[PDB]
């Protein structure tokens, strides 16, 4: 067992619980709504709607500059404690 | 090179699994579905979301199924493609 | 750690830079410009982009002098918000 | 001099007049607006506009899977021999 993983885990896991509440409360967004923006943004990828709240819009900063990195090092412990050991397993010949 | 063929592969299969699921679910034409599953799991972006919460809750656990997979490739495929000019130029 | 100090003000200064430009080349206001300059530097992305010739030509510019900053920032950033816990749980 | 820089660069710049002329031919942008999404896309910042032809988002995918990994090294390259040599220099008390 990984403690950095878990770690990264468990802050990943908080880090989305709280994107999640900040938008459905400040944004008006739908749990699931909050939730995918959350997602979305602290990987990079975007979404087609913005924080309409000035607010909205330094939450985002700040989340996502603390967000970025903990989610990015969680999915690199993820590739190579989990997907990278059940790809190897999955090619063996049995 | 056993390591970028497994790559390549996974990523096509993964992509192929979003078009299939952005297609039927989303209703979004074929290349519509390829080209969202491709510029979501490469951080691109795309100017639209999925619409159904089916939809929203796939995209999440395709992004963290898939991000590090494309990174990967995306990496292996860039020394593939650069090395024969790294080295005509050497 | 001087690293990470010199890390933020660098990335303070371009960010600085940024709002400023928008704000006053792209008529943003300041808080938008700096969200703009934020995601732009993160990758992240918006929901709108220059209006102005001038203002593509800096973005461009603004990509690849920040960029790179800005990822080293988020990672020694990341070290040093997590630390605390991996030590704490450990 | 590094030639792996070298190369990189060159290929970055083709790449990004590759994509000049592709968006601006096919997608009927400007010059500087096929640029500028060819730089966002590349970088995976993203643009509010999407290919609208479906050659253009047949490329736009080809595009970003060789273009990513080519400016990503570019960029990696430029930190370390340009970028980081010069903050060195420049924080050097004289
Ligand atoms: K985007
Ligand atoms: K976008
Ligand atoms: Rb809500
Ligand atoms: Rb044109
Ligand atoms: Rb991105
Ligand atoms: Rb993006």
Same mark, same amino acid.
């Given at each position: ?6 770690? &990264?885990?468990? &802050?990943?896991?908080?880090?989305? @619980? +709280?994107?999640?509440?900040?938008? $459905?409360?400040?944004?008006?967004? /739908?749990? #699931?709504?909050? =939730?995918?923006? +959350? ?9 087609? @709607? +913005? ?6 819009? @330094?939450?985002?900063? &700040?989340? #996502?500059? #603390?967000? #970025?990195? &903990? ?14 050991? +059940? @790809?190897? $397993?999955? =090619?063996?010949? /049995?």
């Amino acid at each position: 067992k990984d403690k950095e993983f878990q770690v &990264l885990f468990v &802050l990943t896991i908080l880090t989305l @619980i +709280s994107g999640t509440i900040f938008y $459905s409360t400040v944004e008006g967004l /739908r749990p #699931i709504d909050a =939730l995918y923006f +959350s997602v979305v943004t602290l990987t990079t990828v975007g979404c087609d @709607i +913005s924080p309409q709240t000035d607010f909205g819009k @330094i939450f985002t900063i &700040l989340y #996502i500059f #603390i967000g #970025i990195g &903990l989610v990015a090092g969680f999915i690199h412990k993820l590739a190579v404690n989990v997907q990278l050991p +059940s @790809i190897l $397993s999955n =090619l063996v010949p /049995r």
